[PDB]
Amino acid sequence: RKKVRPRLIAELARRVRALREQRNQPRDSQLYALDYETLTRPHSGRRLPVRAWADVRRESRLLQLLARLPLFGLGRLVTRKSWLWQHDEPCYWRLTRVRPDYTAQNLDHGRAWGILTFKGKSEDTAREIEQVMYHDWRLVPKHEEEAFTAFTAKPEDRLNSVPYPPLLRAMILAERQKNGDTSVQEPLLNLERTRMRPWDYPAKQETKGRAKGTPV
Amino acid sequence: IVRSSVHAKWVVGKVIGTAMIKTAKVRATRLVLDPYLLKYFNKRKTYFAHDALQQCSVGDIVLLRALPVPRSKHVKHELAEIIFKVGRVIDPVTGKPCAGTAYLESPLSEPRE
Amino acid sequence: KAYHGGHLTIRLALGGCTNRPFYRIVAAHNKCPRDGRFVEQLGSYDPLPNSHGEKLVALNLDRIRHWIGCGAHLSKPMEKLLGLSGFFPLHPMMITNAERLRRRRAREVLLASQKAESEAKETEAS
Amino acid sequence: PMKGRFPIRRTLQYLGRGDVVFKESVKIMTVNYNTYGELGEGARKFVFFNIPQIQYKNPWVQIMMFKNMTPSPFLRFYLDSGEQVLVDVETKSNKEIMEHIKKILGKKEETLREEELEKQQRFHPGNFGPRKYCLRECMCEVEGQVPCPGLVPLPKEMTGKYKAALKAST
Amino acid sequence: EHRELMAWNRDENRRMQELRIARLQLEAQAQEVQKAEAQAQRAQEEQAWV
RNA sequence: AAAGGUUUGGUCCUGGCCUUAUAAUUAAUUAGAGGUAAAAUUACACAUGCAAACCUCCAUAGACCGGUGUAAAAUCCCUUAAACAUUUACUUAAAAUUUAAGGAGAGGGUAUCAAGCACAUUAAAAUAGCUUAAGACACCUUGCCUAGCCACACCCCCACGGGACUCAGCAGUGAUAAAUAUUAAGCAAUAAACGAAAGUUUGACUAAGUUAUACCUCUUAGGGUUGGUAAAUUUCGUGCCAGCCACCGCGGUCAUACGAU
RNA sequence: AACAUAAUUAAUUUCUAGACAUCCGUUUAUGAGAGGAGAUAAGUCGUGUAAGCAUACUGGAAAGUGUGCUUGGAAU
Ligand code: FES
Ligand SMILES: [K+]
Ligand SMILES: [K+]
Ligand SMILES: [K+]
Ligand SMILES: [K+]
Ligand SMILES: [K+]
Ligand SMILES: [Mg+2]
Ligand SMILES: [Mg+2]
Ligand SMILES: [Mg+2]
Ligand SMILES: [Mg+2]
Ligand SMILES: [Mg+2]
Ligand SMILES: [Mg+2]
Ligand SMILES: [Mg+2]
Ligand SMILES: [Mg+2]
Ligand SMILES: [Mg+2]
Ligand SMILES: [Mg+2]
Ligand SMILES: [Mg+2]
Ligand SMILES: [Mg+2]
Ligand SMILES: [Mg+2]
Ligand SMILES: [Mg+2]
Ligand SMILES: [Mg+2]
């Protein structure tokens, strides 16, 4: 070959473009700003879904609650209106760290960390909280913490093993007879190893994407 | 001790040049089938080999071992062995010096020199 | 094409002619075209009844198990096919749709009886 | 008339008659033979008749031949482990040489058969597709299945053109 | 199996080496007799030539 | 190729051209309907409409599908390594998908392109080497490797920047060309995107429209040819004129060769 | 050019800015001017010193002559 030649302009463009992104990174106060008259984000023009309209006017964001508290409410318990309606068992975050967005003129945007207790079961380590910019958060009062966090676990009643599908069960029993294994035991699937979290279980905020800084 | 990527893990060739320092230029030949004629011809390739001791001379048959990491752009082999030295061949079957199709030292004798 | 991102999937590739559909069950990267590059053919589905009135599905159940064990997703039509065969449990929407059809025919039967009763009133009027 | 002596050597059938398929260890086979002499006749015939067959079945093995360098003809194989197998072919017929190398460094019939079957594992007769890869392109070819509309017109009720007309009529 | 075949090969090389030494020995005996006769003719011719 | 016609005064040899077979496009003449397949002058300029959403806010997707053959001897096959903008399992191992560095072998034309001019090794930093008639270097041309792949995405190889500022998505238009499909319907099927989901979206696709370009099934009959090659001519007109031929040739008054019949 | 701020949750800023302005040279064509080789085909006056090859001189320019070579002439 040897007629393939360098592309300096492409190399220059890639680096230069990446540099500009770092310099002009947007802030949470800008990416997640909202115009409540139209329920549309000015930065991108994205109109919120219809099922979120009632709560955007009727509920508060997390750091709106925490900005009014000493130390940004470290140690306080916070729950979500969506959880309160869906799950009878206590669901809340125990706040451990909180990084407000200082640029915001009301310190109403930022990031938070805490220990999750979902449906009465508590995680062992603190991780970043997702959906902090949602209008769904409710601070728990200190005098009501003991009654709110009271939970007694019920014995688990979801089956631990189930039958095999009709065809796959016959193929298992047929192989037994072929190999000389004589038994009338029923093949059983074990569901303990593969049990699914609820769909609304908090997800990993650390591995989540962030929107770009190019305005529409 | 992973081996090289190159296909030629072991190549035999003739030393066609030795003017580079500690490197011997070696010409290997392989047989390639002509598809139209269905006859084999010789395709020759050049291999640079690391001659650490500069013990190679033009015209001697040598065995090269693929280096694990390429020493340079072209030096990707080392001198494993000198199968036949130019003018100084030693018969493999009998072990006696030979000069062409003849024995410089008879195989009946046992000089042990 | 040189795909970046995506996963292997088991899906139906449409073949045949106009008004004559025929499907090839294949394992393919999800970003590939429907009838384009695939990894393995895992069977075939002929959706038109044959002379005996039988819709014919062929499943390479050894290779299907291999690719599900390696992360291959399943398309919803293929999840329905495995449920009818008995290799998978019946899909939730297969059961729901069967219930909807039962509720929809019950209304029709009731309406026909009401119409017959209304027709009976016409018979009474003579 | 095909050029050269023994033009049968330049036919695919002759090249495929070779039975020496070397083990994966074999990497190089040097052939040292003499062009003049009486005890090296089999070696000369081996280069003339057999070397093409060996190369045809072992394309990745380097066969390099040297002439009139030693008093006697011999074969030296270089293996991937670094071992060197010397064979002495003086006073040996070309057929004898082939049988000797087949025994010491040739794959057995059992091993070769297993490789052939493994190669064809992914061809299935039931699979449908182009003629190059499959027996049948479409299920219409199978007997009893609905035939292709191109060859045989479909019933009107099985056609989207007809179904659309009824829906409009409804 | 590889080791056994590589041992059989060395035995074949030794068996053929033994035959080579036997054949070459016979040649030395015959060629020696011919050389002695040829040297005699040279001695006769050389004396005559002198 | 199972061959044939055609150099001569004649025979033989040599040798080119042409005929007979098969297919695609366009054109002349002609033509009913039905089923299917395909749709194609142009990397020239484009009016208008549509082609990417989803969703309890965050995200995910719009990196695909679809289009064109721009550039480049561009590639094929194979090895090693590492990843992914992934998947699914484990909190660590099986895949799909790529990327980078390579090389057993194979890979368009011109040699009136015969030299290239740093194209090498060593690793105290010296040595003077490296490729090349076994085709280097230069130039020219072309998508190939075909279940598909590769390159391109208004132009400046690239795209910070700049410019002459976007249909090479579907349909459609101007110009150009021997070359001429609907400014159409539906997301019911399959595929893709999104969502936990009922579901939503899609000019992908599906079912249609258009066209003797092909095949199939049928029903009307039209088109060409009639010296030889090579199947098949009656009368009359013309008179080296008018015309004809793929090749050999024909026509100057009995033309099976031109025109009508 | 690439520092420093901060630090009893921890983060911020930095993660640069100059310079391509454009070549030398390189290919394709418009093509004054002047020939060359063809096509249409009747003219033009000429044309026995064996022929040809190489070369030289002279011929308004087929040829003639010198020198060597060849028989693809003739020669009892
Ligand atoms: S090719 Fe099978 S339906 Fe047409
Ligand atoms: K001829
Ligand atoms: K002639
Ligand atoms: K481009
Ligand atoms: K649909
Ligand atoms: K006529
Ligand atoms: Mg969600
Ligand atoms: Mg046409
Ligand atoms: Mg595509
Ligand atoms: Mg091009
Ligand atoms: Mg020239
Ligand atoms: Mg354009
Ligand atoms: Mg571009
Ligand atoms: Mg268009
Ligand atoms: Mg576009
Ligand atoms: Mg057309
Ligand atoms: Mg999903
Ligand atoms: Mg007449
Ligand atoms: Mg004719
Ligand atoms: Mg006529
Ligand atoms: Mg002359």
XYZ file of C-alpha atoms in Angstrom, chain B residues 9-93:
85
model
C 7.542 -19.615 13.302
C 10.354 -21.627 11.689
C 11.855 -20.731 8.307
C 14.819 -22.178 6.400
C 16.686 -20.092 3.857
C 20.016 -19.144 2.333
C 22.034 -16.173 3.600
C 22.075 -13.856 0.569
C 23.643 -10.922 2.416
C 25.385 -9.980 5.640
C 26.317 -6.296 5.281
C 24.081 -5.061 8.120
C 25.423 -5.096 11.667
C 24.372 -8.211 13.600
C 21.730 -8.923 10.937
C 21.742 -11.450 8.100
C 19.491 -11.131 5.066
C 18.088 -14.587 4.306
C 16.198 -15.758 1.221
C 13.632 -18.474 1.905
C 11.769 -20.310 -0.840
C 8.416 -22.063 -0.692
C 6.566 -24.092 -3.309
C 3.428 -22.462 -4.720
C 1.004 -24.199 -7.071
C 0.357 -22.489 -10.385
C -3.418 -22.936 -10.830
C -3.401 -22.911 -14.639
C -0.430 -25.251 -15.079
C -0.938 -27.274 -11.868
C 2.833 -27.271 -11.422
C 4.795 -26.084 -8.408
C 7.237 -23.195 -8.701
C 9.444 -21.463 -6.147
C 8.258 -18.280 -4.462
C 11.101 -16.645 -2.550
C 10.820 -14.343 0.458
C 13.422 -12.263 2.286
C 13.738 -12.473 6.076
C 15.960 -10.315 8.250
C 17.393 -12.384 11.099
C 19.276 -11.344 14.227
C 22.843 -12.692 14.036
C 24.103 -11.817 17.511
C 27.604 -13.238 16.989
C 27.925 -12.332 13.282
C 28.591 -16.015 12.590
C 26.858 -16.091 9.184
C 28.382 -16.084 5.709
C 26.783 -15.641 2.309
C 25.580 -18.921 0.836
C 25.065 -20.943 4.028
C 21.730 -22.578 4.834
C 20.289 -21.460 8.172
C 17.250 -22.005 10.381
C 15.486 -18.950 11.805
C 13.269 -18.762 14.891
C 10.518 -16.154 15.058
C 11.236 -13.575 17.741
C 8.483 -13.043 20.338
C 8.585 -9.260 19.838
C 9.796 -7.698 16.559
C 13.234 -6.218 17.149
C 12.636 -3.641 14.403
C 10.413 -3.050 11.387
C 12.001 -5.923 9.446
C 13.967 -7.952 12.029
C 11.364 -10.411 13.339
C 13.529 -13.556 13.403
C 16.759 -14.746 14.994
C 19.432 -17.194 13.865
C 18.481 -20.497 15.473
C 20.939 -22.731 13.627
C 23.316 -22.953 10.676
C 22.191 -26.140 8.929
C 24.953 -26.067 6.296
C 28.011 -23.834 6.362
C 29.212 -22.580 2.987
C 32.061 -24.866 1.933
C 32.241 -26.403 5.426
C 29.360 -28.880 5.282
C 29.270 -31.811 7.713
C 27.295 -34.824 6.540
C 24.303 -35.333 8.879
C 24.026 -39.055 8.148
